[PDB]
Amino acid sequence: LLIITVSGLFIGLVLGLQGYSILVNVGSESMLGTMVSLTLLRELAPVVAALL
Amino acid sequence: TVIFAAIGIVGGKLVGVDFLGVDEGSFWSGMQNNVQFGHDVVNGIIKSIVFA
Amino acid sequence: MNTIAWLGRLVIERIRGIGVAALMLLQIIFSLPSAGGFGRFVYQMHRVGVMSLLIITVSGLFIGLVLGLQGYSILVNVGSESMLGTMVSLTLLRELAPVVAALLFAGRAGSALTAEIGSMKQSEQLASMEMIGVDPLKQIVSPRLWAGIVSLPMLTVIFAAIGIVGGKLVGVDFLGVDEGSFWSGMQNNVQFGHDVVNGIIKSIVFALLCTWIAVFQGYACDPTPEGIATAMTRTVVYSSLCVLGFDFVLTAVMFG
Amino acid sequence: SRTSELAVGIFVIIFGIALFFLAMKVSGLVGTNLSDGYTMKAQFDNVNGLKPRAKVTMSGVTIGRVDSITLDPVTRLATVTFDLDGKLTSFNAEQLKEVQKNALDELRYSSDYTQATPAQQKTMEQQLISNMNSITSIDEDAYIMVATNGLLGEKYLKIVPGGGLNYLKRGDTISNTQGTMDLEDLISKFI
Amino acid sequence: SRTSELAVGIFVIIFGIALFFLAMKVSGLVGTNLSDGYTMKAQFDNVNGLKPRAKVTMSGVTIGRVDSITLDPVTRLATVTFDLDGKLTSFNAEQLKEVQKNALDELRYSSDYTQATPAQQKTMEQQLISNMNSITSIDEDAYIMVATNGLLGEKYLKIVPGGGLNYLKRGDTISNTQGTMDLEDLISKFI
Numbered sequence A: 001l002l003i004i005t006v007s008g009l010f011i012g013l014v015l016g017l018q019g020y021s022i023l024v025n026v027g028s029e030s031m032l033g034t035m036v037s038l039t040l041l042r043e044l045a046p047v048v049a050a051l052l
Numbered sequence B: 001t002v003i004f005a006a007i008g009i010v011g012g013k014l015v016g017v018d019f020l021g022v023d024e025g026s027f028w029s030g031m032q033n034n035v036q037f038g039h040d041v042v043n044g045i046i047k048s049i050v051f052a
Numbered sequence C: 001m002n003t004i005a006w007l008g009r010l011v012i013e014r015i016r017g018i019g020v021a022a023l024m025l026l027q028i029i030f031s032l033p034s035a036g037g038f039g040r041f042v043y044q045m046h047r048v049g050v051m052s053l054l055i056i057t058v059s060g061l062f063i064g065l066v067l068g069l070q071g072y073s074i075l076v077n078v079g080s081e082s083m084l085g086t087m088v089s090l091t092l093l094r095e096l097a098p099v100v101a102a103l104l105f106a107g108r109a110g111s112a113l114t115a116e117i118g119s120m121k122q123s124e125q126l127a128s129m130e131m132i133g134v135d136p137l138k139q140i141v142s143p144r145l146w147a148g149i150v151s152l153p154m155l156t157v158i159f160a161a162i163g164i165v166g167g168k169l170v171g172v173d174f175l176g177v178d179e180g181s182f183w184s185g186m187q188n189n190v191q192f193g194h195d196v197v198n199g200i201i202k203s204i205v206f207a208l209l210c211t212w213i214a215v216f217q218g219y220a221c222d223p224t225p226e227g228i229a230t231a232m233t234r235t236v237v238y239s240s241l242c243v244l245g246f247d248f249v250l251t252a253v254m255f256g
Numbered sequence D, E: 001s002r003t004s005e006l007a008v009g010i011f012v013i014i015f016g017i018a019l020f021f022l023a024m025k026v027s028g029l030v031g032t033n034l035s036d037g038y039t040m041k042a043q044f045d046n047v048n049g050l051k052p053r054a055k056v057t058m059s060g061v062t063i064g065r066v067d068s069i070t071l072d073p074v075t076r077l078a079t080v081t082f083d084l085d086g087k088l089t090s091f092n093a094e095q096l097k098e099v100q101k102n103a104l105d106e107l108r109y110s111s112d113y114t115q116a117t118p119a120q121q122k123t124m125e126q127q128l129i130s131n132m133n134s135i136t137s138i139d140e141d142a143y144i145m146v147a148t149n150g151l152l153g154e155k156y157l158k159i160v161p162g163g164g165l166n167y168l169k170r171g172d173t174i175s176n177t178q179g180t181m182d183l184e185d186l187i188s189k190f191i
Helices: A002-026 A037-042 A044-051 B002-017 B024-032 B037-041 B043-050 C002-029 C037-048 C050-078 C089-094 C096-105 C109-122 C125-132 C136-149 C153-172 C179-184 C192-196 C198-219 C232-254 D002-023 D095-105 D125-131 D183-190 E002-023 E093-107 E121-132 E183-190
Strands: D038-044 D055-057 D062-065 D068-072 D077-084 D143-148 D155-160 E039-043 E055-057 E062-072 E077-083 E144-147 E156-159
Touching (some): A002 C232, A037 B043, A037 C050, A044 C096, B037 B043, B037 D002, C002 C136, C002 E002, C037 C050, C037 C109, C089 C192, C089 C198, C096 C198, C096 C232, C125 C136, C136 C198, C192 C198, C198 C232, D095 D125
Parallel strands (some): E055 E156
Antiparallel strands (some): D038 D077, D068 D077
């Protein structure tokens, strides 16, 4: 439980870093709450939590 | 994976709106205004059973 | 308050446990080169590098295809999929080639290295070698370290190249966009000295922490072969907390 | 024994926390529930990119969802079945007299009375038995149409009223529709 | 050595749960408080396409969140209810006094004591005690409405502070409201 909780953060922060750096020049960062969620719900929670 | 996806989304909100800054309101709004439950989360668990 | 003392004495041990491992690392690289070490080293890179090549090539595709599937499904309603060649490339160059190729390398060669040295301590080949005076740090460890520093940046490059080619396959051959707008939308946006060379500097300092933590837990394990198998799963935890933790501290530097 | 069994118990708690956080803080399960949601049907012509399970509005505010949609291949027209609330969408025990007072007064008002005025009670005994149950605050000459929110948005349905003396049963059709329009239609819609 | 052995485990744990109570704060859950907020209300004609729990601004800065919107079926009109702040929509004790002496400079003004009454003490005695109570720094006819935040995003409430004498209290009603007009109203307006 511990190794997936603190690995839950560092996947989230880089998604919260590149997800901001991409969305600022397009300006439409009403998708930040959607482009954090839909990747983490559809792929990286099935994939990366398996390899850990 | 449920505990992975929950702490992932909360992690994206942390460096997003507390260190870079967007409209938390907007965030939550778009978040809950796009992500269905029986189409996305329950399909995010059916993948995490047949991986297990 | 006794289980408090058990937790307290455990993480006190883990700190000391690091301070030994740094001293073993400075004792390796600050040494004269052994005679004929190159023939040992190239055989070692056969073991760590060339063996792991297959599992990262065919894992290079399946990361690429899902990026070529969700990258299409997102970009169709916004219509502006002149970014498909850019939103396959810039994620695969900046993050998923440093990150995901580390967690697959800690899997195979990250953990097969701590077994091979874990087996050599138990049968006391390493003890027998010391009595002949060949000091096994320079004999067994040091070619098994330099075949890990060199062989990981030679893998993420092969990971990122087959990833981008994989995104082009299900993109324009099964769904269909302009084959011109793919590369011409790509080549213009992706600098070399800012993105690729920064995509390798991350893959060197991942190769150091993923091998030096791996080659340490084989050396300073114990015998009694429940002492090997507790250590081969002590790296793969300790690597993946330090791959991702050191990633995020790095990407804020180069892409602040 | 009890040493590890209870430290399983905080793992079910942490999973129990982050399922609630997924169910009732993000997922649309807080907004799926109706109450005696009855069903209607309407005959459209343009449902372009109008998915099922949308969220219908009436007057600036949501009321419910859209159930399921097929084509009726005998008249080449869309068929839309959709859940319609029987509570906030209709009325309640206070409002039954509040529409009985107004369906009577607007029928038997002496300028507009002669539209079956009371011969014995033909303006008054008819109007209470004209609705008596299942009736809506939804006009007999309303038009429904397809709307969206923003320059991309998502499609839903928009039940705009207008005028209206009579209303609809639980299960009927609206005699006025308006299909969706987009760029392929818009520029020709100008001239 | 139980001196540090126990000092290692204990100092982690009290700090370690202090990380978990950070995760309860930035999750949108039980933490993240406000300043003694309160629920006014207003009545639009249509806010359709509004998300609740949105932003509400004074001029261009957030002062609170929407709480609820509900319909009445008899008049077919929506009614909103929203929370404000008691640090941005409030008064200093000094600033309460500066408007009360300016209330008699406005109620019994140089022109207003000439054409309301020559001894309008009922306007003079009541501006004392009405100001002394819990009043809000939001004006008399300042109409509230719905904006859009740019071109994308989602709608939110906009307070237009047009003039003001007669201030409002907690739970009051703004009787001047403006509904939303989306893009499809604008096209039919033009061509």
